[PDB]
């Protein structure tokens, strides 16, 4: 029930950062090079194509109320740069290790950023960039991090100690810790966005795709058929459908009401790393990136 | 190793 189409394909170095700007038709993408770009999706045209350091950098993400592009790379750094103006406008050493994630919140000046130093670190961007809070208590790389969008008071890390924690601005430790029995580590966790559900959902090593109420801490449902490393899985904001990408070179998409597997694309550039939702989608690989309409 | 750098 889901015409996939092809918007824009681009070979490139890997891609191992992507997301959507909100009101441009825009994606960056951050490179295992050390390159980040931003490319017009529409036009198929660079906008911006930056060589940021001589390591990979993980994470990236827009912060268009500013004009900006946010990235952290495994010189320990974290960079903002004014897209408009192309100029680099912040840059500190954030972590003593690489930075794997990056999210930030929907209506405040804050940053959060997960680091292979075991933690996860708060920015205030209107303090001159100070460090508010270290949230400390994972035993191992913190993978991903992400704001709870019906209540940016709370996010979430995910850790390949095979844990997500849920914290509070302001709290010392997590409201709440999750063991996942995904005994590889848990790579990437994501909230579903809308009032129905509290639900929240993981990616493994192991395989597995794991969905998680939020409220009775219960699995709800275990997704399965990916057959190495799952990168990432993420609920789409529109659409009743899970997105998942794996280093098996698919992307799968799964039908968030019975919890199977609608759709399996393998799109030809090797691994998948990451993934972004604007119905666009769009998947960073080994080999380029692609960005897909499904309605 | 490769967890770390890949």
């Known amino acids: 029930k889901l015409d996939i189409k092809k918007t824009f394909s681009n070979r490139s170095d890997r891609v191992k950062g992507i997301d959507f700007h909100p009101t441009e038709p825009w994606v960056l993408t951050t490179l295992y090079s050390g390159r980040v770009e931003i490319w017009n999706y529409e036009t198929q045209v660079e906008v911006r194509s930056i060589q940021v350091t001589e390591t990979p950098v993980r994470a990236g993400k827009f912060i268009a109320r500013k004009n900006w592009i946010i990235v952290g790379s495994d010189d320990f750094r974290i960079r903002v ?25 929907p209506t405040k000046p804050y940053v959060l950023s997960g680091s292979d130093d075991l933690t996860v670190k708060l920015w205030n961007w209107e303090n001159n960039w100070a460090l508010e809070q270290t949230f400390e208590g994972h035993e191992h790389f913190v993978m991903c991090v992400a704001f709870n969008p019906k209540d940016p008071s709370t996010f979430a890390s995910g850790c390949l100690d095979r844990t997500v924690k849920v914290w509070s601005l302001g709290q010392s430790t997590p409201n709440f810790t999750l063991t996942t029995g995904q005994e590889r580590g848990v790579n990437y966790v994501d909230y579903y966005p809308l009032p129905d559900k509290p639900y929240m959902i993981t990616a493994s090593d192991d395989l597995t795709i794991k969905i998680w109420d939020y409220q009775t801490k219960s699995c709800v449902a275990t997704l399965e058929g990916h057959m190495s490393n799952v990168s990432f899985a993420v609920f789409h904001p529109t659409l009743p459908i899970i997105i998942s990408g794996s280093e098996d070179g698919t992307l799968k998409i799964w039908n968030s009401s019975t919890y199977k597997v609608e759709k399996t694309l393998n799109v030809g550039l090797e691994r998948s790393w990451c993934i972004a939702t604007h119905n666009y989608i769009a998947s960073g690989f080994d080999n380029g990136f692609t960005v897909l309409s499904l309605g | 190793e490769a967890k770390k750098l890949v």
């Open chain 1, 81 to 105: 740069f004014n897209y408009n103006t192309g100029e680099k406008v912040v840059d500190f050493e954030a972590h003593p290790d690489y930075i794997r994630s990056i999210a930030v919140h």
